Amino acid sequence: PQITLWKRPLVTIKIGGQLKEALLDTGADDTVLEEMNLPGRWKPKMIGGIGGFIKVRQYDQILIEICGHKAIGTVLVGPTPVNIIGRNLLTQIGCTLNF
Amino acid sequence: PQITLWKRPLVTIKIGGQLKEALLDTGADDTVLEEMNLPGRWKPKMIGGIGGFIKVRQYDQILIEICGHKAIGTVLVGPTPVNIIGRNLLTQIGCTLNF
Numbered sequence: 115p116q117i118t119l120w121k122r123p124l125v126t127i128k129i130g131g132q133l134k135e136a137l138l139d140t141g142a143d144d145t146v147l148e149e150m151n152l153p154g155r156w157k158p159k160m161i162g163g164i165g166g167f168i169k170v171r172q173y174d175q176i177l178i179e180i181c182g183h184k185a186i187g188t189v190l191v192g193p194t195p196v197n198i199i200g201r202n203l204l205t206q207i208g209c210t211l212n213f
Numbered sequence: 214p215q216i217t218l219w220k221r222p223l224v225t226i227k228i229g230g231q232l233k234e235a236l237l238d239t240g241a242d243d244t245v246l247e248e249m250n251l252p253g254r255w256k257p258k259m260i261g262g263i264g265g266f267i268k269v270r271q272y273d274q275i276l277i278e279i280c281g282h283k284a285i286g287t288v289l290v291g292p293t294p295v296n297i298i299g300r301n302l303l304t305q306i307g308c309t310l311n312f
C-alpha cells in the first residue's frame with residue numbers, strides 16, 4: 115500500500131503474541147518498542163535523539179509482522195513514548211520513500 | 214525518486230541560501246535543524262523527542278529546497294543531534310511511504 119504523511123504513519127504490528135500500534139519511521143536506524151516483557155536474552159544499550167538518551171534492552175532475531183508482512187531482526191525495548199519501526203525492519207517489508 | 218532504506222535517507226537541502234545534509238524522517242512531525250543563523254523573526258518553543266524536551270527557535274514560512282523540490286513551512290532550530298525533515302515538509306514535496 116501507499117501511506118501519505120498528512121498524519122503520523124501509524125500501523126498495526128504483531129510481536130510476542132501482541133498487537134500494537136507503531137510508527138513507520140525512516141529516521142530510526144533500529145526498531146524501538148514501548149516497555150514490554152519479552153522472554154529470552156538481551157543486552158543493554160543506549161540510543162540517543164532529541165532530548166538525549168534512553169536505556170533500552172536489545173533483543174535479537176525477534177519476529178514482527180507489519181501490515182501482514184513478516185520481518186525478523188533486532189528489537190530494542192525501553193521507555194520510548196511511541197512504538198517505532200526502524201529501517202532494520204522497514205527494509206525487510208520492502209518499504210521505500212517516493213517523491 | 215524511489216529511496217530504499219538500507220542506508221540513512223540523507224539528502225542535500227538548501228535553506229537560507231546554504232546547503233546542508235538532512236534526514237528524511239517520517240517519524241518526525243516537525244522539521245528540526247541544527248544550530249544555524251536564519252533571517253527573519255522567530256519565537257521560542259519546546260519539542261520532545263525520544264530522550265526528552267529541547268528548546269528551539271521556530272521560523273515560520275521559511276523557503277527550503279529538498280532534492281530540488283521546493284517547500285515553504287515551519288523550521289525549528291535547536292540542539293538536535295541530526296538535521297531532520299519532518300512530515301510538515303515531506304507532505305509539501307509529495308513524499309509517501311510505499312511497500
Ligand SMILES: CC(C)CN(C[C@@H](O)[C@H](Cc1ccccc1)NC(=O)O[C@H]1CO[C@H]2OCC[C@H]21)S(=O)(=O)c1ccc(CO)cc1
Nearest residue numbers: 139141142143144161162163164240241242243262263295
Ligand atoms: C531524531 C532522529 C534522527 C532519530 N529518531 C527517530 C525520529 O523519527 C523520532 C521518533 C519519535 C520519538 C519520540 C516521539 C515521537 C517520534 N522523531 C522525533 O524526534 O520528532 C520530533 C520533531 O518532530 C516531532 O515529531 C515527533 C517527535 C518530534 S529517535 O526517536 O530519537 C531514535 C534514535 C535511535 C533508534 C535506534 O537506532 C530509534 C529511534
